[PDB]
Design a protein around this motif. Structure first.
Motif, PDB file in Angstrom:
ATOM      1  N   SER D  77       0.851  19.010 -10.375  1.00 17.16           N
ATOM      2  CA  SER D  77      -0.481  19.567 -10.524  1.00 17.16           C
ATOM      3  C   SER D  77      -1.270  18.578  -9.264  1.00 17.16           C
ATOM      4  O   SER D  77      -0.896  17.488  -9.368  1.00 17.16           O
ATOM      5  CB  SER D  77      -0.831  19.086 -11.902  1.00 17.16           C
ATOM      6  N   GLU D  78      -2.463  19.051  -9.105  1.00 15.40           N
ATOM      7  CA  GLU D  78      -3.143  17.938  -8.222  1.00 15.40           C
ATOM      8  C   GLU D  78      -3.827  16.867  -9.077  1.00 15.40           C
ATOM      9  O   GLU D  78      -3.899  17.210 -10.367  1.00 15.40           O
ATOM     10  CB  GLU D  78      -4.522  18.719  -7.497  1.00 15.40           C
ATOM     11  N   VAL D  79      -4.021  15.748  -8.663  1.00 16.17           N
ATOM     12  CA  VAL D  79      -4.299  14.563  -9.552  1.00 16.17           C
ATOM     13  C   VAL D  79      -5.014  13.508  -8.683  1.00 16.17           C
ATOM     14  O   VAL D  79      -4.861  13.433  -7.378  1.00 16.17           O
ATOM     15  CB  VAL D  79      -2.883  13.657  -9.990  1.00 16.17           C
ATOM     16  N   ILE D  80      -6.199  12.819  -9.366  1.00 18.38           N
ATOM     17  CA  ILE D  80      -6.963  12.018  -8.302  1.00 18.38           C
ATOM     18  C   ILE D  80      -6.081  10.608  -8.787  1.00 18.38           C
ATOM     19  O   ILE D  80      -6.284  10.055  -9.996  1.00 18.38           O
ATOM     20  CB  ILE D  80      -8.352  12.005  -8.692  1.00 18.38           C
ATOM     21  N   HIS D  81      -5.859   9.883  -7.768  1.00 19.05           N
ATOM     22  CA  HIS D  81      -5.132   8.730  -7.788  1.00 19.05           C
ATOM     23  C   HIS D  81      -6.252   7.517  -7.619  1.00 19.05           C
ATOM     24  O   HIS D  81      -6.706   7.645  -6.293  1.00 19.05           O
ATOM     25  CB  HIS D  81      -4.206   8.443  -6.806  1.00 19.05           C
ATOM     26  N   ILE D  82      -6.472   6.891  -8.403  1.00 16.15           N
ATOM     27  CA  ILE D  82      -7.635   5.933  -8.155  1.00 16.15           C
ATOM     28  C   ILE D  82      -7.173   4.405  -8.087  1.00 16.15           C
ATOM     29  O   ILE D  82      -6.329   4.086  -8.776  1.00 16.15           O
ATOM     30  CB  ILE D  82      -8.803   5.876  -9.194  1.00 16.15           C
ATOM     31  N   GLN D  83      -7.860   3.592  -7.250  1.00 15.41           N
ATOM     32  CA  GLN D  83      -7.571   2.214  -6.901  1.00 15.41           C
ATOM     33  C   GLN D  83      -8.986   1.395  -7.009  1.00 15.41           C
ATOM     34  O   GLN D  83      -9.608   1.433  -6.215  1.00 15.41           O
ATOM     35  CB  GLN D  83      -6.966   1.917  -5.652  1.00 15.41           C
ATOM     36  N   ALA D  84      -9.052   0.972  -8.292  1.00 15.40           N
ATOM     37  CA  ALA D  84     -10.161  -0.056  -8.485  1.00 15.40           C
ATOM     38  C   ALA D  84      -9.822  -1.198  -7.865  1.00 15.40           C
ATOM     39  O   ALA D  84      -8.566  -1.860  -8.062  1.00 15.40           O
ATOM     40  CB  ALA D  84     -10.395  -0.060 -10.000  1.00 15.40           C
ATOM     41  N   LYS D  85     -10.903  -1.830  -7.179  1.00 13.28           N
ATOM     42  CA  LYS D  85     -10.406  -3.129  -6.418  1.00 13.28           C
ATOM     43  C   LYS D  85     -10.755  -4.178  -7.568  1.00 13.28           C
ATOM     44  O   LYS D  85      -9.979  -5.342  -7.298  1.00 13.28           O
ATOM     45  CB  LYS D  85     -11.451  -3.087  -5.257  1.00 13.28           C
ATOM     46  N   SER D  86     -11.615  -4.181  -8.545  1.00 19.81           N
ATOM     47  CA  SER D  86     -11.557  -5.405  -9.381  1.00 19.81           C
ATOM     48  C   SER D  86     -11.809  -4.743 -10.960  1.00 19.81           C
ATOM     49  O   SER D  86     -12.050  -3.547 -11.233  1.00 19.81           O
ATOM     50  CB  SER D  86     -12.795  -6.122  -9.379  1.00 19.81           C
ATOM     51  N   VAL D  87     -11.636  -5.539 -11.822  1.00 19.57           N
ATOM     52  CA  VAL D  87     -12.172  -5.270 -13.407  1.00 19.57           C
ATOM     53  C   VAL D  87     -13.629  -4.848 -13.581  1.00 19.57           C
ATOM     54  O   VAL D  87     -13.854  -3.794 -14.325  1.00 19.57           O
ATOM     55  CB  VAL D  87     -11.713  -6.280 -14.456  1.00 19.57           C
ATOM     56  N   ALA D  88     -14.618  -5.352 -12.991  1.00 20.00           N
ATOM     57  CA  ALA D  88     -15.900  -4.894 -12.784  1.00 20.00           C
ATOM     58  C   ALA D  88     -15.878  -3.376 -12.758  1.00 20.00           C
ATOM     59  O   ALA D  88     -16.348  -2.551 -13.566  1.00 20.00           O
ATOM     60  CB  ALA D  88     -16.569  -5.611 -11.472  1.00 20.00           C
ATOM     61  N   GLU D  89     -15.261  -3.017 -11.646  1.00 24.79           N
ATOM     62  CA  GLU D  89     -15.074  -1.522 -11.061  1.00 24.79           C
ATOM     63  C   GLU D  89     -13.994  -0.899 -12.154  1.00 24.79           C
ATOM     64  O   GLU D  89     -14.178   0.471 -12.343  1.00 24.79           O
ATOM     65  CB  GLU D  89     -14.410  -1.604  -9.861  1.00 24.79           C
ATOM     66  N   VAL D  90     -12.958  -1.755 -12.737  1.00 24.49           N
ATOM     67  CA  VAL D  90     -12.150  -0.841 -13.784  1.00 24.49           C
ATOM     68  C   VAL D  90     -13.199  -0.194 -14.715  1.00 24.49           C
ATOM     69  O   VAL D  90     -12.950   0.968 -15.096  1.00 24.49           O
ATOM     70  CB  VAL D  90     -11.142  -1.593 -14.262  1.00 24.49           C
ATOM     71  N   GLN D 110      -1.907  -1.908 -10.316  1.00 24.66           N
ATOM     72  CA  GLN D 110      -2.509  -2.673 -11.259  1.00 24.66           C
ATOM     73  C   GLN D 110      -3.841  -2.148 -11.456  1.00 24.66           C
ATOM     74  O   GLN D 110      -4.412  -2.011 -12.867  1.00 24.66           O
ATOM     75  CB  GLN D 110      -2.320  -3.918 -11.334  1.00 24.66           C
ATOM     76  N   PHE D 111      -4.873  -1.660 -10.781  1.00 28.52           N
ATOM     77  CA  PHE D 111      -5.962  -1.307 -11.051  1.00 28.52           C
ATOM     78  C   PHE D 111      -6.031   0.230 -10.538  1.00 28.52           C
ATOM     79  O   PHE D 111      -7.050   0.778 -10.104  1.00 28.52           O
ATOM     80  CB  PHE D 111      -7.029  -1.917 -10.107  1.00 28.52           C
ATOM     81  N   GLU D 112      -5.016   0.856 -10.901  1.00 27.80           N
ATOM     82  CA  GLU D 112      -4.626   2.143 -10.514  1.00 27.80           C
ATOM     83  C   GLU D 112      -4.664   3.084 -11.916  1.00 27.80           C
ATOM     84  O   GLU D 112      -4.317   2.722 -12.788  1.00 27.80           O
ATOM     85  CB  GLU D 112      -3.521   2.501  -9.686  1.00 27.80           C
ATOM     86  N   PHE D 113      -5.363   4.238 -11.931  1.00 27.43           N
ATOM     87  CA  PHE D 113      -5.624   5.138 -12.854  1.00 27.43           C
ATOM     88  C   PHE D 113      -5.525   6.478 -12.345  1.00 27.43           C
ATOM     89  O   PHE D 113      -5.765   6.663 -11.011  1.00 27.43           O
ATOM     90  CB  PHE D 113      -7.151   4.927 -13.481  1.00 27.43           C
ATOM     91  N   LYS D 114      -5.305   7.545 -13.096  1.00 24.22           N
ATOM     92  CA  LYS D 114      -5.121   8.907 -12.616  1.00 24.22           C
ATOM     93  C   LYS D 114      -5.991   9.573 -13.486  1.00 24.22           C
ATOM     94  O   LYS D 114      -5.918   9.439 -14.825  1.00 24.22           O
ATOM     95  CB  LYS D 114      -3.618   9.162 -12.500  1.00 24.22           C
ATOM     96  N   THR D 115      -6.580  10.653 -13.360  1.00 30.00           N
ATOM     97  CA  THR D 115      -7.358  11.751 -13.719  1.00 30.00           C
ATOM     98  C   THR D 115      -7.002  13.030 -13.146  1.00 30.00           C
ATOM     99  O   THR D 115      -6.919  13.145 -11.800  1.00 30.00           O
ATOM    100  CB  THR D 115      -8.980  11.309 -13.817  1.00 30.00           C
ATOM    101  N   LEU D 128     -19.635   6.537  -6.332  1.00 33.34           N
ATOM    102  CA  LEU D 128     -19.613   5.171  -6.602  1.00 33.34           C
ATOM    103  C   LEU D 128     -18.787   4.348  -5.416  1.00 33.34           C
ATOM    104  O   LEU D 128     -18.559   2.888  -5.658  1.00 33.34           O
ATOM    105  CB  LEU D 128     -18.773   4.835  -7.853  1.00 33.34           C
ATOM    106  N   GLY D 129     -18.400   5.130  -4.474  1.00 29.53           N
ATOM    107  CA  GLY D 129     -17.605   4.564  -3.473  1.00 29.53           C
ATOM    108  C   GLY D 129     -16.190   3.916  -4.155  1.00 29.53           C
ATOM    109  O   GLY D 129     -15.827   2.967  -3.527  1.00 29.53           O
ATOM    110  N   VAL D 130     -15.796   4.321  -5.233  1.00 31.06           N
ATOM    111  CA  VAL D 130     -14.497   4.058  -5.584  1.00 31.06           C
ATOM    112  C   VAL D 130     -13.642   4.745  -4.718  1.00 31.06           C
ATOM    113  O   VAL D 130     -13.823   6.090  -4.250  1.00 31.06           O
ATOM    114  CB  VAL D 130     -14.254   4.408  -7.029  1.00 31.06           C
ATOM    115  N   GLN D 131     -12.318   4.090  -4.379  1.00 29.23           N
ATOM    116  CA  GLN D 131     -11.251   4.577  -3.478  1.00 29.23           C
ATOM    117  C   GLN D 131     -10.089   5.205  -4.195  1.00 29.23           C
ATOM    118  O   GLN D 131      -9.427   4.645  -5.179  1.00 29.23           O
ATOM    119  CB  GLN D 131     -11.402   3.926  -2.263  1.00 29.23           C
ATOM    120  N   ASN D 132      -9.972   6.439  -3.792  1.00 30.77           N
ATOM    121  CA  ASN D 132      -9.091   7.333  -4.528  1.00 30.77           C
ATOM    122  C   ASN D 132      -8.114   8.023  -3.169  1.00 30.77           C
ATOM    123  O   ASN D 132      -8.483   7.771  -2.217  1.00 30.77           O
ATOM    124  CB  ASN D 132      -9.856   8.398  -5.254  1.00 30.77           C
ATOM    125  N   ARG D 133      -7.488   9.229  -4.066  1.00 28.33           N
ATOM    126  CA  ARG D 133      -6.988  10.070  -2.848  1.00 28.33           C
ATOM    127  C   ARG D 133      -6.032  11.109  -3.830  1.00 28.33           C
ATOM    128  O   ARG D 133      -5.661  10.724  -4.637  1.00 28.33           O
ATOM    129  CB  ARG D 133      -5.954   9.391  -2.001  1.00 28.33           C
TER     130      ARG D 133
END
Ligand code: NI
Lengths: 147, 148, 153, 148
Positions: D77-90, D110-115, D128-133
């Motif tokens: 399924s399409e999925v948003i792969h997220i890369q938080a650069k720090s815990v602040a941002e997690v 490590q600071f990757e999550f998916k939704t 939020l300028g969080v970086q994903n793909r």
């Protein structure tokens, strides 16, 4: 230091008494340990058992002594009154606002409901297009719809 | 591909027409697009212009070739059936549920209401002490409560 | 009628001054129209040309004329503090709370977090068992954690 | 009727077997009970005792007769792969997603999550300028964060 309520001015009381009120905003009635400067400068703390869950209400007696008293007053706020035409139209508003997470109180009568002003609750209400009005007034915690 | 409402065989229709519907579970009623194979194993896909915003109603007349009808059946589901005892009670329910973010349908009488069964919910309804019954039942997309 | 800030006291100001704090509750720091009463007599309205996005903070100078200052005190309230063990755990709390639509604030170090005490919010925090003590404490706007509105802004 | 999660495949077991797969989306793994049609023809009789919270995972081995097996494939399924650069941002992210009552999964990095992919949730992630793909991929209910 107050612990339990000696009832309400409402239940007579023709006053008659001297009354010092304790002026509380609507969002403040569920406070449980609290200290207060009364209307007339006085001091009064509260630390309650069986605190009335829903909240403290208009004219709640914290302190009666002879002809001396302290009641709760509840300061008037900006408020959207709501007039549902129909029993259906009620359910609709209510679920809607619920969904929104706004606060919600019974009106003085049957298809009436007041909730605080918020510019987007207005929004909603216009969208679905309901009979409302904003009126500075009083949301007794006794009138509330459980969190 | 199929496109048009021609309505709903609620306009009896004591058939007169051999029937063959598609089966959507109640929420699948708002796919803007998708394909399925009908109940008697026949084929047709979907496209969506102006399909009523609420979702597909019960017996939404899709296809017609003579008497041989292709349409929509909404499967029955586990359902909480609420009987309010007073306009107040209603409002509580609705606010409380609508807040839960759960989903609500108008009932048979003025004071009746239907939402999907869950435990959190049933639970809730007993921690408020409304009378209800859990039944298996259809949920017309048309008697849904909207959200905005 | 007040228009915009004049910086904070963090920028000392080793007072050496007469601060007349206005006293805010945690959720009151974001209004841009509201009428106040300083700690002593003074009446004070606020109409804010370019409010800070996250809110007024501790002792932000609402008014600086001569020695006479008026800054923002932020009242204390019951805070559930939270110290949480790992990046996974953090990630839970946060998600679980955002869902709860509750207010939430970064604590002192990389792992800690604060939220207003309510009962549910706490009840669960045990029900999933993160370390947390409830303390009368200050909730600084500068250290919030956006918002929300719940669901769509 | 199946109950038994006879097990799960990745305990090798390296086929070894003819294995008929049955293909659900992520949203479908939830049920204790309901029915289906397999890759090569057939149809499933089941309910679940210990429906592991989470639900039906990848190749949870449903039926097992000789080298004759069926089990769960889960579709991409399409999925948003997220890369938080720090815990602040997690924290900012998790919270702000939970705040949408959207769906969310632990990552791999490590600071990757998916939704799941949703055009507003995206909209969120860029504000939020969080970086994903956005990538077509699998979703392990063994990896969804819970909500109590
Ligand atoms: Ni919500």
């Amino acid at each position: 230091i107050i612990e339990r309520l000696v009832g309400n001015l409402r239940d007579l009381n023709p006053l008659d008494f001297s009354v010092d009120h304790v002026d509380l905003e609507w969002f403040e009635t569920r406070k449980k340990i609290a200290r207060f400067k009364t209307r007339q400068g006085k001091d009064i703390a509260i630390r309650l058992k069986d605190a009335p869950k829903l909240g403290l209400s208009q004219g709640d007696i914290l302190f009666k002594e002879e002809k001396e008293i302290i009641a709760v007053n509840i300061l008037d706020s900006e408020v959207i009154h709501i007039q549902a035409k129909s029993v259906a139209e009620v359910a609709k508003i209510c679920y809607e606002i619920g969904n929104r997470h706004a606060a919600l109180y019974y009106g003085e009568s049957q298809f009436e409901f007041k909730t605080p002003f918020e510019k987007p609750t207005l929004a909603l209400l216009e969208k679905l297009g309901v009979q409302n009005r904003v009126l500075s007034s009083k949301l007794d915690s006794k009138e509330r719809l459980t969190v």
